[PDB]
């Protein structure tokens, strides 16, 4: 056993988080843990936008994820953009993130990151996609997956639930049920963080006048929307 | 190796950052931070047992910028190192982006530096807490706290020190009673009085004008109260 | 306590390799080395433990030939000739070699050397340079296997009134004593350093004639 | 130890033999599997340049680096001095590279030994050198490195004599190995023998042995 | 030189060097196991440690280290004054320093073996004391427990303080009452301030110092013995605690109160393990070795161990508590199942009630007869031996009726969970643990028999006082603990193999169905429970394969 | 294990290397500093070994004409402080304020406690980099008696002390501190009145007067 | 037996605050031979006493750093060479940039500052040589230890049973302190001092080296037939 196995153990000790890919989108969901009512939950985000069409969630050590999100955001512009004039596809961005994690593992005097990432995205010529990146630096595509603490039961439920005709709403419902079955403390809209990669939203672009420019596909649900969805469970 | 350097243990632990959390309590000083509707108050214990010390030069409160102040729990050398780094970062941010650095951005920068300390083997973590307070232009009265583990988050109110648990419990009960996220007091003097009274009730002891240190952040700026101001606040408390 | 024992361990070069003996007289300096007995079809000319630094300076070694010190000495001599239009002193070259060892001190570097030379300031000079970055001026000196007995013989024999031929005979006799007889022309190699001829290495015929003369002297 | 283990790795390599004659140098393969393509096979005797050839023994991958470095050094010498590299200069360069790689820790410097053969340009004197780890290089008239070594060296000592080297090249080539043969000749001449010629030599050896047995037995 | 060294070892305990502390604790145990912690000074000696022991010790040490041997060191009868008469008066300061060192070590991350060793150290120290020093130590320990500056970390070592406290109750149960009352009061205060109102099912947060009190209560209730006939107050407190607290990590801890209460009233065990009894005929001059090398260590007068034997009142109280708790839990779970819900509170309440049922089953294990449906090792079974005596006591029959009702309710709960909560996992794990307890507790206790407690470890004390080729150079404590261990083995030597009844067969079928599940978090504990049941039952392999 | 290398936190959250450095500091000679009215006086004990020139072994050093201060570690720290003061003077054209100089020294000392590749300082500004303002400062072997005398002076003079009398008080306190052992006194002065705010060495008649006053005490 | 856990590197403090590597480097001076340093009001002298065998030369102990300053060494030769080269470079810089002869006290300060850096770096080694520095004219005499300490003494002795010479100097301080204007008598006093440190060993023209510098007298080294007490 080495540092990679210890990082995997640290990931297994983290909060669960999930990911479900349907025919017309991807759903990411997780639980925010803060055992201190004085602390404000809104100031901390567990789902981060990487590109207008690619988002990520994590399980493991929070500060490592916070640094990795900034590194991935910078590399999405330095490597692919400013060259081809467009955001990279999901596969190439996942490859760059895996390269960063692999360099962290291989570099001397540096410990590997203690997080596992679930990355959801959409791109032309490839549709929607969902990937998992491990601390070692190896990434794998998935149809539906989970990590963290209650990952075994979540994986069993996803295997019993996932199919080929699943839609975005059904994926959201299944993700909410899976989160409810393994919520550590308090199950409400302020403790659930859910995002979807789906249709482009022109109302979030911020301006009008360019027909070719479309809105982002990443959309982060608000607390009210999550509560309304939970009222339907 | 796993006990002396910042690498993963077989249990996936980090037995050099937890030791920094232990080192944060080398001093016996308790700090309390609350926020009003247009202000933020920080109170800290001031202990000067030695008669040869100069009480004016003993302080754990730093003025990082015009609007942002910080209170540090832990040894003073690491506290001053972190204060110097925060001041340099704030000045660089002001020079680069043309506007004042927010409190949460500074807290995030310091947390990222702490994470860098935790991940590199040749650098040791600093045993400090680094509670930043300000009145933000867009957010308002804001308190953000970090730790040697690189974790930071904002608080409605917070307490640090060896006896922080009782203060935290009293704050939680008070906010449960009030059902609001701040203290309803327009004037910051009333907020300082409330904080001092809460600390007195939690610690079960009285304070003089030489046993406390106070910092108040308003929209205009952040400033540290003098001993005479603390004495006047204590007199006002005693009047009722 | 603590002390630099790696340097002392390196200085224990009594078993480093073949014996090398240098004798300094008023007419020249003689260097004699032991030739290993190898396969008959091997070209023994490829074994050279006596090396030329420059016309007026030669070197002898006891350990493995494999180099950097000899190249540095040659480069230093050429550089001094280029910069001052003259020949470098033997002691100056020895100090340059020692400084090279020191810079490249708690760890030894290189192997021991016997540096012989001539210059107008100190006449003929012989120095022993050690891998510790230091050196010693010597009136005859032996290194390698059987160095203690050879050094005792040199102490008993050296008398400051020797000639070049007598120095060669002494070197051959001491090499034969160390190697225990049967040294005709293929178990030894001789070289000389003189003011007029510079640095020369004796051919096999001259060494065989010297061995014959030594045998005749022993017969008396 | 590091040099001793490298020498042990050398001892596991395929046998190689180098012999020098009056005006020629002769440099001396395992059993290929049934599904192995021999059309594209790196010959064990690699020519460094038109007048100097190299034959390795030990790890092949580590020998490729030495061969490439020797070729690059020969081309650099040709470009820098307008004169093609000599045999001794190239052998010394290879030995220096090996000696440099032995230091700086040296888990395994190269684990390979080499035989460098040829003629100096504008000269007709055969040159044969043997290079081993630790940077030690020596000169030989008949040398062997590989599995047997001792037996082949004893056979050469009892057969090859240092009083009248073979004048012709056929006798130098006609060597019993108990097979690849490369012949180096002056004026930058290199010839690699074919399978048929080596088979003819083997049949000649067998017929000579049969005749000797018939005469005496 | 012993007592002085005994001081220097106690004040030298560290909070950074764990190995040094382990070595020091080994030395302290070795010192304590062979000396009595009592003041041997008579009525009017006017002798002191400082003026008598220290000068002789310093002179002897200087003489020895100068280069001479103890042969040439000549002394007088004043050495006897420098002996126990003056050296036995320094125990109280050492005990105070030891207590403060333990309260410091409470907030130190330590290995389990070191914690167990320290607990054994404290218990041996307690059992090596006379009545005066024991009373002083008990008062000091309670005073430090009720007022200290420890338990600041989120992972404290509670057992370093809770276990010794119950040890006091083991030696003198008269201290149990008021202390227990105080605990109850403090517990309510922690509930009044809002402890346990935030669900953190993963771990325990820094808001539940109440846990300390909880754990103490457990250990104290483990050794009240007959000093429990505040029964109604304790029952009311348990009901209040079970109705006012809903937190799975806290529910697990609170469920052990009933187990301790039931086990303390019906378990045959020893209570006295002192080095020398208070009314000992051995003179107070041959006690400084524990009679390790003296034949009088085999005397029946010296080895008159004090045991605990349940009486009719204790058995009646245990039966009443068992019936009341069983009815309460069954009614609560039936009310919950009347109106099923899907929130976390519903599942947490069900799990808490099932855990309470399991601990009620486990606490009264010794009252169960494995051959009820239908030996040599006749342990202290309250209802008697053979079969005529058992059938003449209605309490035996009503206890077995209660157990059968509990089994039927377990089957009903399994059916309800299968038909309504298929995707749930935690409730099934709790039910599996309950079935395991119900099957493996037919007259003996095995859930907590291996866990460390406030008894002297037989293996530890044996390793301390063992010399090869010497016939048992032990002390009274060692003999008492060996007798207790042999009794425990004779209890855990009966055979529970029996023909499976209808209820047992039905529960085995349920466990088989749970063993072939799709969730790895469910079937692995189900597989373990199935293995345990197959070991318990006869012919279960045929049903399993069929 | 935790005490064998610098920059390693013990389980209780301490760096035992800095504590051992403090132990080394406690083995040094006595140094005293007195804060009088508009001035500071510094006093140093200097042990005599034998053949030693009684006048030139100065231990007191000056920084930027207005600041007074294991001897080689202290010399290194003073050199770094001089460099920082020169940098401040060049940047801002004004002499560096005392709090700024103290903060820069504290940062520099705290730098040497972050990496295990360096050894913490063993001088007195504590070895951990901590510092504060004092009415009177005492360090060295006889520091406790000096601290008691300084507390007596603080109690006896609630309205401040004159610099001229502060020199004599420092001499007396130094003699009392040395009384424990069984030596020379060096005194340095920096006051707004007798020195115009520039650090100076007090010698000559005033030194003799201070020595006589200390001897009479 | 009695294994020391705090004598590995120079970046570890003993629990009592000691630096064992520095102490070992100090003890390394005892390996070297005996050097004696005097000082009058107008002149300063150095006296130095090894030979590998009868066929070898004698090690040099006195090194000239400038036309008015010099030193003698006891201990490791390469460390002394490095320190002497550094001092020569510093003197050259002082004479070139400012046209000012470097003071002996400043030279001692520079030596102390340089030597301090090897006691805090890790992975290196402290110097293993002790030095006696003498200067122009008033005359000055310094004793440098590898720990980073200078003394400014009237006279001293270091290395290989030098205690006899040191005691003789402590006795005859007042006698030799005022031999101004007569360098030969000061040299003879130093010779007697170094003879007081010899265990019946004699002094010859091959084992004895002397150094002299004073007012109007540039630094001068006497060896060979020049140390015949002439």
From Swiss-Prot, chain A:
Domain of life where this protein originates: Eukaryota
Family annotation (Pfam families): Proteasome, Proteasome_A_N
Disulfide bond residue pairs: none
Ubl conjugation is among the record's keywords: yes
Gene3D superfamilies with a match to the protein in the record: Glutamine Phosphoribosylpyrophosphate, subunit 1, domain 1 (3.60.20.10)
One record GO biological process: proteasomal ubiquitin-independent protein catabolic process
GO annotations of cellular component type: nucleus; proteasome complex; proteasome core complex, alpha-subunit complex; proteasome storage granule
Keywords of the record: Cytoplasm, Isopeptide bond, Nucleus, Proteasome, Ubl conjugation
Keyword Cell membrane: no
Note: Present with 7060 molecules/cell in log phase SD medium.
Quaternary structure annotation from Swiss-Prot or TrEMBL: The 26S proteasome consists of a 20S proteasome core and two 19S regulatory subunits. The 20S proteasome core is composed of 28 subunits that are arranged in four stacked rings, resulting in a barrel-shaped structure. The two end rings are each formed by seven alpha subunits, and the two central rings are each formed by seven beta subunits. The catalytic chamber with the active sites is on the inside of the barrel.
Listed name of the protein: Proteasome subunit alpha type-2
Species this chain originates from: Saccharomyces cerevisiae (strain ATCC 204508 / S288c)
UniProtKB/Swiss-Prot annotation, chain B:
Protein name as annotated: Proteasome subunit alpha type-1
Compartment(s) of residence: Cytoplasm; Nucleus
Note: Present with 15200 molecules/cell in log phase SD medium.
Recorded superkingdom: Eukaryota
Primary location: cytoplasm
Gene Ontology CC: mitochondrion; nucleus; proteasome complex; proteasome core complex, alpha-subunit complex
Oligomer and partners: The 26S proteasome consists of a 20S proteasome core and two 19S regulatory subunits. The 20S proteasome core is composed of 28 subunits that are arranged in four stacked rings, resulting in a barrel-shaped structure. The two end rings are each formed by seven alpha subunits, and the two central rings are each formed by seven beta subunits. The catalytic chamber with the active sites is on the inside of the barrel. Interacts with CIC1.
Key words of the record: Acetylation, Cytoplasm, Isopeptide bond, Nucleus, Phosphoprotein, Proteasome, Ubl conjugation
Residues annotated as signal peptide: none
Originating organism: Saccharomyces cerevisiae (strain ATCC 204508 / S288c) (Baker's yeast)
SUPFAM superfamilies found in the cross-reference section: N-terminal nucleophile aminohydrolases (Ntn hydrolases)
Pfam families given in the database record: Proteasome, Proteasome_A_N
Phosphoserine: residues bearing it: 226
Glycyl lysine isopeptide (Lys-Gly) (interchain with G-Cter in ubiquitin) crosslink site(s): 221
GO biological process: proteasomal ubiquitin-independent protein catabolic process; proteasome-mediated ubiquitin-dependent protein catabolic process
Stated family: Belongs to the peptidase T1A family.
Swiss-Prot record, chain D:
PROSITE patterns to which the protein is assigned, alphabetical: PROTEASOME_ALPHA_1, PROTEASOME_ALPHA_2
The keyword Disulfide bond appears for this protein: no
Stretches the record annotates as Disordered: 204-217
Main location: cytoplasm
Sequence similarity: Belongs to the peptidase T1A family.
Miscellaneous comment text of the record: Present with 16800 molecules/cell in log phase SD medium.
Annotated protein name in UniProt: Proteasome subunit alpha type-4
Native organism taxonomy: Eukaryota, Fungi, Dikarya, Ascomycota, Saccharomycotina
Gene: PRE6
UniProtKB/Swiss-Prot annotation, chain G:
Pfam families: Proteasome (PF00227), Proteasome_A_N (PF10584)
Presence of keyword Ubl conjugation: yes
SMART domains in alphabetical order: Proteasome_A_N
Protein name: Proteasome subunit alpha type-6
Localization: Cytoplasm; Nucleus
Lineage: Eukaryota, Fungi, Dikarya, Ascomycota, Saccharomycotina
Family (UniProt): Belongs to the peptidase T1A family.
Additional remarks: Present with 7210 molecules/cell in log phase SD medium.
Keyword list, A-Z: Cytoplasm, Isopeptide bond, Nucleus, Phosphoprotein, Proteasome, Ubl conjugation
Species the sequence originates in: Saccharomyces cerevisiae (strain ATCC 204508 / S288c)
Stored InterPro entries: Ntn_hydrolases_N, Proteasome_alpha, Proteasome_alpha-type, Proteasome_asu_N, Proteasome_sua/b
Underlying gene: PRE5
């Amino acid at each position: 056993l080495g540092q990679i196995d210890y990082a995997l153990t640290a990931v297994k000790q983290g909060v669960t988080s999930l990911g479900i890919k349907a025919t017309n989108g991807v759903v990411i969901a997780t639980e925010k843990k803060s055992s201190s009512p004085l602390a404000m939950s809104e100031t901390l985000s567990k789902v981060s936008l990487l590109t207008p069409d690619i988002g990520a969630v994590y399980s493991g050590m929070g500060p490592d994820y916070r640094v990795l999100v900034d590194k991935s955001r910078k590399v999405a512009h330095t490597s692919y953009k400013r060259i081809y004039g467009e955001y990279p596809p999901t596969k190439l961005l996942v490859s760059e993130v895996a390269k960063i994690m692999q360099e962290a593992t291989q570099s001397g005097g540096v410990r590997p990151f203690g997080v596992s990432l679930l990355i959801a995205g959409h791109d032309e010529f490839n549709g929607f996609s969902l990937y998992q990146v491990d601390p070692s630096g190896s990434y794998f595509p998935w149809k539906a997956t989970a990590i963290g603490k209650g990952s075994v039961a979540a994986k069993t439920f996803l295997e019993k639930r996932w199919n080929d005709e699943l839609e975005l709403e059904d994926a959201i419902h299944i993700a909410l049920l899976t989160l409810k079955e393994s919520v550590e403390g308090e199950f409400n809209g302020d403790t659930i963080e859910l995002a979807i990669i789906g249709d482009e939203n022109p109302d979030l672009l911020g301006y009008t006048g360019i027909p070719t420019d479309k809105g982002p596909r990443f959309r982060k649900l608000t607390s009210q929307e999550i509560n309304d969805r939970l009222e339907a469970l | 190796y796993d006990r002396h350097i910042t690498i993963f243990s077989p249990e996936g632990r980090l037995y050099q950052v937890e030791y920094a959390f232990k080192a944060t309590n080398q001093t016996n000083i308790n700090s309390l931070a609350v926020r009003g509707k247009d202000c933020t108050v920080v109170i800290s214990q001031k202990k000067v047992p030695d008669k040869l010390l100069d009480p004016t030069t003993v302080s754990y409160i730093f003025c990082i910028s015009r609007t942002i102040g910080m209170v540090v729990n832990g040894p003073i050398p690491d506290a001053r190192n972190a204060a110097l780094r925060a001041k340099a970062e704030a000045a660089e941010f002001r020079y680069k982006y043309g506007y004042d650095m927010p409190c949460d951005v500074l807290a995030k920068r310091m947390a990222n530096l702490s994470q860098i300390y935790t991940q590199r083997a040749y650098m040791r973590p600093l045993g400090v807490i680094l509670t930043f307070v300000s009145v933000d232009e867009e957010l308002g009265p804001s308190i953000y706290k970090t730790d040697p583990a690189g974790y930071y988050v904002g608080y409605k109110a917070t307490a640090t020190g060896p006896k922080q648990q009782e203060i935290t419990t009293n704050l939680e009960n008070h906010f449960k009673k009030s059902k609001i996220d701040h203290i309803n007091e327009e004037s910051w003097e009333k907020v300082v009085e409330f904080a001092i009274t809460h600390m007195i009730d939690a610690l079960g002891t009285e304070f003089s004008k030489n046993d406390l240190e106070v910092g108040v952040a308003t929209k205009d700026k952040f400033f540290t109260l003098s001993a005479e101001n603390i004495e006047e606040r204590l007199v006002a408390i005693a009047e009722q | 306590e603590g002390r630099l024992f790696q340097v002392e361990y390196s200085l224990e070069a009594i078993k480093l390799g073949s014996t090398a003996i240098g004798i300094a007289t008023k007419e020249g300096v003689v260097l004699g080395v032991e030739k290993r007995a190898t396969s008959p079809l091997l070209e023994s000319d490829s074994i050279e433990k006596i090396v030329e630094i420059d016309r007026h300076i030669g070197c002898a070694m006891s350990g493995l030939t494999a180099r950097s010190m000899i190249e540095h000495a040659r480069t230093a001599a050429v550089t001094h000739n280029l910069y001052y239009d003259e020949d470098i002193n033997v002691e100056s070259l020895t100090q340059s070699v020692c400084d090279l060892a020191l810079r490249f001190m708690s760890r030894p570097f290189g192997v021991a050397l016997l540096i012989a030379g001539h210059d107008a300031d100190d006449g003929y000079q012989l120095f022993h340079a050690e891998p510790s970055g230091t050196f010693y001026r010597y009136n005859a000196k032996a290194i390698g296997s059987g160095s203690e007995g050879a050094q005792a013989e040199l102490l008993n024999e050296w008398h400051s009134s020797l000639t070049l031929k007598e120095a060669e005979l002494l070197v051959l006799k001491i090499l034969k004593q160390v190697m225990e007889e049967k040294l005709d022309e293929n178990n030894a190699q001789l070289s000389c350093i003189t003011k007029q001829d510079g640095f020369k290495i004796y051919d096999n015929e001259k060494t065989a004639e010297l061995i014959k003369e030594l045998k005749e002297k022993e017969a008396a | 130890f590091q040099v001793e283990y490298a020498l042990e790795a050398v001892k596991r390599g395929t046998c190689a033999v180098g012999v020098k004659g009056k005006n020629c140098v002769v440099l001396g393969r395992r059993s290929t599997l049934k599904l192995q393509d021999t059309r594209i096979t790196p010959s064990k005797v690699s020519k460094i340049d038109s007048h100097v050839v190299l034959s390795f023994s030990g790890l092949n991958a580590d020998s490729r680096i030495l061969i490439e470095k020797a070729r690059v050094e020969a081309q650099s010498h040709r470009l820098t001095l307008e004169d093609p590299v000599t045999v001794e200069y190239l052998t010394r360069y290879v030995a220096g590279v090996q000696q440099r790689y032995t230091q700086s820790g040296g888990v395994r410097p190269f684990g390979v030994s080499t035989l460098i053969a040829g003629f100096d340009p504008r000269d007709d004197e055969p040159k044969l050198y043997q290079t081993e780890p630790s940077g030690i290089y020596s000169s030989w008239s008949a040398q062997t490195i590989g599995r047997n070594s001792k037996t082949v060296r004893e056979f050469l000592e009892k057969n090859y004599d240092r009083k009248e080297p073979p004048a012709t090249v056929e006798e130098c080539v006609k060597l019993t190995v108990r097979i690849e043969i490369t012949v180096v000749k002056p004026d930058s001449d290199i010839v690699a023998l074919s399978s048929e010629e080596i088979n003819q030599y083997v049949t000649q050896i067998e017929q000579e042995k049969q005749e000797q047995q018939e005469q005496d037995k | 030189h012993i007592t002085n060294v005994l001081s220097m070892l106690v004040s030298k305990l560290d909070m950074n060097d764990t190995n040094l502390t382990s070595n020091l604790i080994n030395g302290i145990v070795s010192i304590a196991a062979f000396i009595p912690i009592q003041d041997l000074t008579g009525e009017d000696d006017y002798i002191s440690f400082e003026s008598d022991t220290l000068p002789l010790v310093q002179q002897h040490f200087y003489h020895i280290k100068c280069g001479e041997s103890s042969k040439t060191f000549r002394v007088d009868d004043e050495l006897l004054n420098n002996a126990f008469k003056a050296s036995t008066t320094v125990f109280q300061s050492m005990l105070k320093v030891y207590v403060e060192k333990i309260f410091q070590l409470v907030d130190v991350d330590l290995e389990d073996s070191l914690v167990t060793k320290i607990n054994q150290t404290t218990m041996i120290l307690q059992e090596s004391m006379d009545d005066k020093i024991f009373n002083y130590f008990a008062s000091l320990l309670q005073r430090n427990f009720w007022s200290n500056d420890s338990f600041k970390e989120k992972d404290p070592n509670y057992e370093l303080v809770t276990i010794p406290l119950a040890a006091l109750v083991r030696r003198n149960n008269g201290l149990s009452k008021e202390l227990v009352r105080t605990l109850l009061f403090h517990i309510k205060e922690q509930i009044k301030r809002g402890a346990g109102s935030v669900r953190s099912t993963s771990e325990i947060q820094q808001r539940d110092v109440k846990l300390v009190l909880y754990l103490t209560a457990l250990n104290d209730v483990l050794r009240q013995c007959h000093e429990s006939l505040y029964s109604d107050e304790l029952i009311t407190f348990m009901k209040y605690l079970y109705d006012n607290v809903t937190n799975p990590p806290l529910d697990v801890i609170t469920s052990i109160v009933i187990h301790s209460a039931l086990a303390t009233l019906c378990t045959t065990e020893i209570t006295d393990c002192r080095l020398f009894p208070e009314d000992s005929k051995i003179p107070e001059k041959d006690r400084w070795g524990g009679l390790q090398f003296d034949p009088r260590r085999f005397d029946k007068q010296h080895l008159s161990f004090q045991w605990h034997v349940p009486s009719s009142d204790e058995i009646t109280l245990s039966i009443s508590i068992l019936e009341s708790l069983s009815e309460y839990c069954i009614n609560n779970v039936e009310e919950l199942m009347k109106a099923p819900r899907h929130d976390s509170e519903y599942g947490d309440m069900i799990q808490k009630y099932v855990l309470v049922m399991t601990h009620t089953l486990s606490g009264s294990s010794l009252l169960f007869d494995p051959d009820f449906n239908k030996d040599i090792y006749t342990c202290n079974y309250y209802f008697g031996n053979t079969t005529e005596e058992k059938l003449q006591n209605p309490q035996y029959l009503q206890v077995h009726r209660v157990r059968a009702r509990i089994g039927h309710f377990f089957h009903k709960l399994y059916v309800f969970l299968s038909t309504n909560f298929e995707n749930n996992t935690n409730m099934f794990q709790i039910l599996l643990h309950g079935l395991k307890v119900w099957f493996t507790d037919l007259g003996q206790e095995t859930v907590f028999n291996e866990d460390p407690n406030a008894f002297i470890d037989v293996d530890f004390l044996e390793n301390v006082q063992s010399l090869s080729h010497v016939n048992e150079p032990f002390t009274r404590t060692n003999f008492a603990i060996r007798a207790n261990s042999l009794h425990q083995s004779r209890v855990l030597l009966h055979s529970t193999n029996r023909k499976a009844s209808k209820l047992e067969n039905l529960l085995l079928v349920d466990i088989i169905q749970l063993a072939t599940s799709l969730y790895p978090d469910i079937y692995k504990p189900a597989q373990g429970t199935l293995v345990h049941c197959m070991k318990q039952l006869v012919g279960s392999y045929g049903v399993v394969i069929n | 294990g935790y005490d064998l290398s610098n920059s390693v936190f013990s389980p209780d959250g301490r760096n035992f290397q800095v504590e051992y450095a403090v132990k080394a500091v406690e083995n040094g000679t006595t140094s005293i500093g007195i804060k009088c009215n508009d001035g500071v006086v510094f006093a140093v004990e200097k042990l005599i070994t034998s053949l030693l020139v009684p006048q030139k072994n100065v231990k007191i050093q000056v920084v930027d004409r207005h600041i007074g201060c294991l001897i080689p570690d202290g010399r290194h720290l003073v050199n770094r402080g001089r460099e920082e003061a020169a940098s401040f003077k060049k940047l801002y054209k004004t002499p560096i304020p005392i709090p700024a100089f103290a903060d820069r020294l504290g940062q520099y000392v705290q730098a040497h406690t972050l990496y295990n590749s360096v050894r913490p300082f063993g001088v007195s500004l504590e070895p951990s980099g901590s510092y504060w303002g004092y009415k009177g400062a005492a360090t060295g072997k006889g520091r406790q008696s000096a601290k008691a005398e300084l507390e007596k002076l603080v109690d006896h003079h609630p309205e401040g002390l004159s610099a001229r009398e502060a020199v004599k008080q420092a001499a007396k306190i130094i003699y009392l501190a040395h009384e424990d052992n069984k030596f020379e006194l060096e005194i340095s002065w920096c006051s707004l009145s007798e020195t115009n705010g520039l650090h100076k060495f007090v010698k000559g008649d005033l030194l003799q007067e201070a020595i006589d006053f200390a001897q009479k005490e | 037996m009695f294994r020391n856990n705090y004598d590995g590197d120079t970046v570890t403090f003993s629990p009592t605050g000691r630096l064992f590597q520095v102490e070992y480097a100090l003890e390394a001076i005892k390996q070297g031979s005996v050097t004696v340093g005097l000082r009058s009001n107008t002149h300063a002298v150095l006296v130095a006493l090894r030979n590998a065998d009868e066929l070898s030369s004698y090690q040099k102990k006195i090194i000239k750093c400038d036309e008015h300053m010099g030193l003698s060494l006891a201990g490791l030769a390469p460390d002394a060479r490095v320190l002497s080269n550094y001092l020569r470079q510093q003197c050259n810089y002082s004479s070139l940039v400012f046209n000012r002869k470097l003071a002996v006290e400043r030279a001692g300060h520079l030596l102390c500052d340089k030597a301090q850096k090897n006691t805090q770096s890790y992975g290196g080694r402290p110097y293993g040589v002790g030095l006696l520095i003498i200067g122009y004219d008033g005359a000055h005499l310094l004793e440098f230890q590898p720990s980073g300490n200078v003394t400014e003494l009237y006279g001293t002795a270091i290395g290989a049973r030098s205690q006899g010479a040191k005691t003789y100097l402590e006795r005859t301080l007042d006698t030799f302190i005022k031999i101004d204007g007569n360098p030969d008598e000061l040299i003879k006093a130093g010779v007697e001092a170094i003879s007081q440190s010899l265990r019946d060993e004699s002094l010859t023209v091959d084992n004895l080296s002397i150094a002299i510098v004073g007012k109007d007298t540039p630094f001068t080294i006497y060896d060979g037939e020049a140390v015949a007490k002439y």
